[PDB]
Design a protein around this ligand. Structure first.
Ligand SMILES: [Mg+2]
Ligand SMILES: [Mg+2]
Lengths: 202, 175, 191, 151, 50
RNA sequence: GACAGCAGGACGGUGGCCAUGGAAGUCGGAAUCCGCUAAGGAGUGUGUAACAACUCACCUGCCGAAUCAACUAGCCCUGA
C-alpha cells in the first residue's frame, strides 16, 4: 500500500485547493484524540482541519503546474507542526475566538508551563481511603465527617515544574484542573492575501 | 586446471564429425580462459560435453586461437559470473574487478576465489565475462576506486628485507 | 574492504587553544589544561584555520575496526573540549535503606570516607584520582558531587565509589542500597 | 450519579455496587428494590443502568448501548430451563429497527448523519448480521438508503 | 521510601537482560552475550521481577 | 525526505460478543468491521485479582541521505 493512498491524498488536497481558496494555518502541539473529536464534531458545519507530513508541501508542485496566483508564499510557513484549515464561509472575523473551546485538562506527566496548582482547604468527597497519595507526597490532612479535608494551603506544581506520575494520579482523582492547551492559529490566508495577525485580523 | 601464473583467453570453435545421416555440424564457439591451449582444448571439451551431445572422439576442434586484448592500455571494469562448488552445495556468484586486461581480471578472479572462499580450480566454472562501464558497478571497492582526482599516500611502507646489510647501525624509518 | 580516507571534523571555539606535537594532543583553556597520548592508533591529526581552529582526524586505508577507531578520537577530543571549557560534574544521591550512609571527605576532597555502610561497622576509605575534587552538596540530602576535568578520571572515581558501596552475599533486588551516579553534566550551566 | 453496565436477574446475594452510595448512606436495600421495580420485564439480558441521586432517592435511567440492543432484538426468554442450543441462533430481519436505533443514538458515535452507521451496526453484530437470504458483504457496499430520509 | 531513588536503584540493578547460557548481566537493550564463554549467543531473558 | 535518535497522539461505537472469580484492547473459545481520521490494529508486551496507569503497531514535530531484513559459505571463537 501507501502508493494508491498517497495518490488519493493528493486527490483530496487538490480537491480542497480547488474548492476552498481560503485557509487558516494552525498548530496542534498539545493535542488529544478526544480533543480532536470534540473540535471536529463542533466544527462539522464549517471549516475542515487537515494535517500531515512533507506531503503538505504540495503547493510547490501545484505552483509548478502554473495554474495559480501566488500561493507559494506559505511554503516557508509549514514548519513545526503546521496544519491547514480549509474554509469557504468567512468573510467573517469572529471565528475561533468565540469557538476556542476549553478542553480537559486531564493530568499527564511531562508538561511544565504555564500555571500553578493551589489547593485550599477543601474536602475530597472520594471513597475510602484516599490518603495514600497524600501520604506519598506529604500533605497535612484532617478527617472530618467522612470526606477528608486539607489543613494547610500548599502548592503542588509550580511554574516550570515537572509533572510526576503520582501527582498526575492524585490530580486525576481529585479532578482539580491541570494544564490544558488548545490549538494555535498562526497565519490567515484569504485569496492570496498576506495577513500579519499581530494584531490585524479579528 | 592449474591457473599457473597469468591466464590466457582462447577462442575455440568445434563441431561434430560429418556423418552421412547428418552433415554440416553447427560449428559452435566458446571463450575459454586457460594457461595454455592444451588446457583450453580440454576445458572446451568439458564445457561442450556438459552443454550438448558432444564428446572428444565423435567431434573435432576446428580452431583454437589466442584472443589478444582490445585495449591493453586502459584501466577497465570486468564483471565475472561464477558457478563455484562449495563444500555444502554449489553457488552462483557475481564479482567485479578493476584491471587492465580480460585474462588478468579472470586471473584475479581465480586467485580471489582461492583466497577468500578456499575454492580450487576444479570447482570454478566461469559463466560469463563482461566489460562494464562506470556508474554500473555494484561493488563498493570498485565504486570507491571510481574517483577522479583521487588521493592516497603510502603510510608505513617497509621494504628491502636484507637488501641492506644484516648488521647496520641504522634503524630504518618509513615514508 | 580497505576504505580510502575517513576523516572526522572538529570545530574548536575561540575560548581554548590546542597544540599537537604528533599524536599527543594538549588542550589549554580556562579550566586548566589537559593532555593525552594517541600513540597506539596511528591516525593522522591535522589542524587548519588561522585563528579558526578546524581539526581533522584522518585515517587512510585501514580495516573496519580501525574505521570504527577513527571516530573515537573525535569523540574524546570533543570530551576534552567540554572538560576544558565547562568541566564535568557528577551528582550521586545516596539511595539508602534503613541504615543511612554517612559520607565525609578527609584530604582536600580526594579521600571519601564512608560509614554505616549498610550497617557494617567497617569504615571504608576511597582514594580518588589525581585531578578530581569532590564535595558534599548543600540544600539537598546526601548528595555527593564529583567535579573535575578529565571524564575518564572523574567517572572512574565515581565507579570506584559506586562499586565500594555494594551489597554483598545477599539479594540485590531487595536491599536497593548504595551510592549510585544519579546525574551526569557540566559545572558551568547554561552553555 | 452512578453508572453500571451489568444485568442478569436482580440477585442481591450479599453482593452489590454501593461504593459511591454510602457517602449519603441512602441505598442499602431501597435503591436495589427500586432498581428491581425499574428492571421488571426489562429484562433478562445485560443492560446499562445509571442512577441519579439528589439526597433522597435514585432516578433510574437505562442508556441503551448498541450491542446490548442488538442482543435485545433476539428472541427472549433464555435464562435457564434447557439452555445451550447452542449460542448463536439469531434469525431476525432488523431492516428498520436498527434505523430507528441509530436515530436514537446521539452524541456518542462521532458519526455521519446515518451515513456509515449502516456499516457500523451491520458489522458490529456477531449472531445475525443479515437476513438468511443474502450475505453481509452486500450490506457493507449496496446500501444507498437512509442517508436522505434519516437526517 | 523515596520512589524516585528506588527507580534509580532499579535502573542500576534491576532492568537488565540475563543470558540463558553464559549467565551475564549485560544491558536492557542487549542482543548478545558480550562474554566469550558461550559464543555471543542471542538466548536472552529479562531479569526477574516480582 | 527512510533507517536511527529525541518529543507529541494512540480515540468513539464498545465495560464488543461465548464465558462469571473476573477479561473493560492484556487467562481463554470464536473472530476482525465502520466513523474521526494524521492515527489507533475489537490490539505487541509490562502490570492490579479486576477497573485503572506505561509502551509498541500506526501517525506526526526536528535532523538529514542512504538504510534494513532473511538465508549462504571462508577464517576464527563457543560447543571441547
Ligand atoms: Mg541468602
Ligand atoms: Mg577449536
Amino acid at each position: 500500500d501507501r502508493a494508491t493512498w498517497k495518490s488519493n491524498y493528493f486527490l483530496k488536497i487538490i480537491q480542497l485547493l480547488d474548492d476552498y481558496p481560503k485557509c487558516f494555518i494552525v498548530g496542534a502541539d498539545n493535542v488529544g484524540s478526544k480533543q480532536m473529536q470534540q473540535i471536529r464534531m463542533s466544527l462539522r458545519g464549517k471549516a475542515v482541519v487537515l494535517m500531515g507530513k512533507n506531503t503538505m508541501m504540495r503547493k510547490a508542485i501545484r505552483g509548478h503546474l502554473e495554474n495559480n496566483p501566488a500561493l507559494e508564499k506559505l511554503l516557508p510557513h509549514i514548519r513545526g507542526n503546521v496544519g491547514f484549515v480549509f474554509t469557504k464561509e468567512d468573510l467573517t472575523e469572529i471565528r475561533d475566538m468565540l469557538r476556542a473551546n476549553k478542553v480537559p485538562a486531564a493530568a499527564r506527566a511531562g508538561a511544565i508551563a504555564p500555571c500553578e496548582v493551589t489547593v485550599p482547604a477543601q474536602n475530597t468527597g472520594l471513597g475510602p481511603e484516599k490518603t495514600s497519595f497524600f501520604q506519598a507526597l506529604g500533605i497535612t490532612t484532617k478527617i472530618s465527617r467522612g470526606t477528608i479535608e486539607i489543613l494547610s494551603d500548599v502548592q503542588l506544581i509550580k511554574t516550570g515544574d515537572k509533572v510526576g506520575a503520582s501527582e498526575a494520579t492524585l490530580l486525576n482523582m481529585l479532578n482539580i484542573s491541570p494544564f490544558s492547551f488548545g490549538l494555535v492559529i498562526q497565519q490567515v490566508f484569504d485569496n492570496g492575501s498576506i495577513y500579519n495577525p499581530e494584531v490585524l485580523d479579528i | 586446471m592449474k591457473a599457473s601464473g597469468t591466464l590466457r583467453e582462447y577462442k575455440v570453435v568445434g563441431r561434430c564429425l560429418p556423418t552421412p545421416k547428418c552433415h554440416t555440424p553447427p560449428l559452435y564457439r566458446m571463450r575459454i580462459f586457460a594457461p595454455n591451449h592444451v588446457v583450453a582444448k580440454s576445458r572446451f571439451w568439458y564445457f561442450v560435453s556438459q552443454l550438448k551431445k558432444m564428446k572428444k572422439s565423435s567431434g573435432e576442434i576446428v580452431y583454437c586461437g589466442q584472443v589478444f586484448e582490445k585495449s591493453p592500455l586502459r584501466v577497465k571494469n570486468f564483471g565475472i559470473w561464477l558457478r563455484y562448488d562449495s563444500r555444502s552445495g554449489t553457488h552462483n556468484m557475481y564479482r567485479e574487478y578493476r584491471d587492465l586486461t580480460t585474462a588478468g581480471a579472470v586471473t584475479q578472479c581465480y586467485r580471489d576465489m582461492g583466497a577468500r572462499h578456499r575454492a580450487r580450480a576444479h570447482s570454478i566454472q566461469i559463466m560469463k565475462v563482461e566489460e562494464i562501464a562506470a556508474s554500473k558497478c555494484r561493488r563498493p571497492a570498485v565504486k570507491q576506486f571510481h574517483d577522479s582526482k583521487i588521493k592516497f599516500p603510502l603510510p608505513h611502507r617497509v621494504l628491502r628485507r636484507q637488501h641492506k646489510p644484516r648488521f647496520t647501525t641504522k634503524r630504518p624509518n618509513t615514508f | 574492504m580497505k576504505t580510502i580516507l575517513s576523516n572526522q571534523t572538529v570545530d574548536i571555539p575561540e575560548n581554548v587553544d590546542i597544540t599537537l606535537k604528533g599524536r599527543t594532543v594538549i588542550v589549554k583553556g580556562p579550566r586548566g589544561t589537559l593532555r593525552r597520548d594517541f600513540n597506539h592508533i596511528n591516525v593522522e591529526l591535522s589542524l587548519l584555520g588561522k585563528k579558526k581552529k578546524r581539526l581533522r582526524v584522518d585515517k587512510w586505508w585501514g580495516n573496519r575496526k580501525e574505521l570504527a577507531t577513527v571516530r573515537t578520537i573525535c569523540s574524546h577530543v570533543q570530551n576534552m573540549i567540554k572538560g576544558v571549557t565547562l568541566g564535568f560534574r557528577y551528582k550521586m544521591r545516596s539511595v539508602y535503606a534503613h541504615f543511612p550512609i554517612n559520607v565525609v571527605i578527609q584530604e582536600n576532597g580526594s579521600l571519601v570516607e564512608i560509614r554505616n555502610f549498610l550497617g557494617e561497622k567497617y569504615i571504608r576509605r576511597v582514594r580518588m584520582r589525581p585531578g578530581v575534587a569532590c564535595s558534599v552538596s548543600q540544600a539537598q540530602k546526601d548528595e555527593l558531587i564529583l567535579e573535575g576535568n578529565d571524564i575518564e578520571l572523574v567517572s572512574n572515581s565515581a565507579a570506584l565509589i559506586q562499586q565500594a558501596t555494594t551489597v554483598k552475599n545477599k539479594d540485590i533486588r531487595k536491599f536497593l542500597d548504595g551510592i549510585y551516579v544519579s546525574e551526569k553534566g557540566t559545572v558551568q550551566q547554561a552553555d | 450519579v452512578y453508572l453500571r453496565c451489568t444485568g442478569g436477574e436482580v440477585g442481591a446475594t450479599s453482593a452489590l455496587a454501593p461504593k459511591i452510595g454510602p457517602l449519603g448512606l441512602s441505598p442499602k436495600k431501597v435503591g436495589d428494590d427500586i432498581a428491581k421495580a425499574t428492571g421488571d420485564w426489562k429484562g433478562l439480558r445485560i443492560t446499562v443502568k445509571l442512577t441519579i441521586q439528589n439526597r433522597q432517592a435514585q432516578i433510574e435511567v437505562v442508556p441503551s448501548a448498541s450491542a446490548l440492543i442488538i442482543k435485545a432484538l433476539k428472541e427472549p426468554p433464555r435464562d435457564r430451563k434447557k439452555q445451550k442450543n447452542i449460542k448463536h441462533s439469531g434469525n431476525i430481519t432488523f431492516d428498520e429497527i436498527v434505523n430507528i436505533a441509530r436515530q436514537m443514538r446521539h452524541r456518542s458515535l462521532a458519526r455521519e448523519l446515518s451515513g456509515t452507521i449502516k456499516e457500523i451496526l451491520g458489522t458490529a453484530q456477531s449472531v445475525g448480521c443479515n437476513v438468511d437470504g443474502r450475505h453481509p458483504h452486500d450490506i457493507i457496499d449496496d446500501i444507498n438508503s437512509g442517508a436522505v430520509e434519516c437526517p | 521510601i523515596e520512589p524516585s531513588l528506588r527507580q534509580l536503584a532499579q535502573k542500576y540493578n534491576c532492568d537488565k537482560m540475563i543470558c540463558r547460557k553464559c549467565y551475564a548481566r549485560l544491558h536492557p537493550r542487549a542482543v548478545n552475550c558480550r562474554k566469550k564463554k558461550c559464543g555471543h549467543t542471542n538466548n536472552l531473558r529479562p531479569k526477574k521481577k516480582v
